Amino acid sequence: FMENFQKVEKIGEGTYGVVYKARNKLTGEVVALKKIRLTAIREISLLKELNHPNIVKLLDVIHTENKLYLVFEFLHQDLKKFMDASALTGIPLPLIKSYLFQLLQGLAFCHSHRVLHRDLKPQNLLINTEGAIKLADFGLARAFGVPVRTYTHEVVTLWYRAPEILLGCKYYSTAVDIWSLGCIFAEMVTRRALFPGDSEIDQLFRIFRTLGTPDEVVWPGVTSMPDYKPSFPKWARQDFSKVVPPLDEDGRSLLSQMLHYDPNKRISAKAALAHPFFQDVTKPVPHLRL
Ligand SMILES: C[C@H]1CCCN1C(=O)c1ccc2cnc(NC3CCN(S(C)(=O)=O)CC3)nc2c1
């Protein structure tokens, strides 16, 4: 158990719990060990079987005392750090394309098993030296949750949240992951966050100012959503040539479909993999300083 792992260093602090790089003394394996301070056991057990090359593997689940430990495959960097390192030059388009393709493969797999991530962001997209990128730390919105008191003060990032979540829908779909991934795609291309809101309303209004305030024409039922207000300002939609300028028309077309307001119009991961933007996809080697 915990006695079977030698902590190497703390690699992260969160609302749920802290994550350490650690060595498994029985196997010699280097892992990420997440400690969560306190149905869930069963929902987590299911995640153990959700195995895919583009999903960070949940190796072990240890339930002991009032603590839950999740042992994950360890990767050496996240996309946030890689983007920051690449900010002067930009991630090359072929590598952006490869990462987007691989993440859509991971999403198509999880979504086909009815599992949503719900909280994609650059910090939960992990990369290795071979050119792979993997989805980490699937959120359990239906179960899980534990005390955050010991967990250091942590402001939840809203920048990648789909509009249906911000508008109060509680029974949202796999489409929320495509929205988040579209925001991340835009940020890799332009080297700036697409919608960096600092509150729920600022997040919503930044979306509206770029994509236009949604109405019943583009999003049937939007005006009946729980947090929709008729008093929302009415802004016009901007052109994607202005929004992600450097990007070609195949990329802009795909991004537009990933950012459709109506979750039933928003492209699925599976359909996205067939988009013409991926006609020339390859798997480049990233320049990773470790
Ligand atoms: C995803 C995070 C977001 C907060 C929760 N959570 C994890 O539970 C988690 C799970 C598996 C991991 C595997 N591996 C690593 N490895 C880190 C090495 C250091 N780097 S870095 C800052 O880019 O140098 C980031 C990746 N972390 C993991 C974290």
UniProtKB/Swiss-Prot annotation:
Its main location: cytoplasm. Disulfide bonds: none annotated. The active site is at 119 (proton acceptor). Gene3D superfamilies: Phosphorylase Kinase, domain 1, Transferase(Phosphotransferase) domain 1. The modification N-acetylmethionine is found at residue 2. The modification N6-acetyllysine is found at residue 7. ATP binds at residues 11-19, 34, 73-75, 78, 121-124, 137. SUPFAM superfamilies: Protein kinase-like (PK-like). Its cofactor is Mg(2+). SMART domains: S_TKc. The modification Phosphotyrosine is found at residues 16, 20. The keyword Nucleus applies. One of its GO terms (cellular component) is Cajal body. PANTHER family: CELL DIVISION PROTEIN KINASE, CYCLIN-DEPENDENT KINASE 2. This is Cyclin-dependent kinase 2. It comes from Homo sapiens.
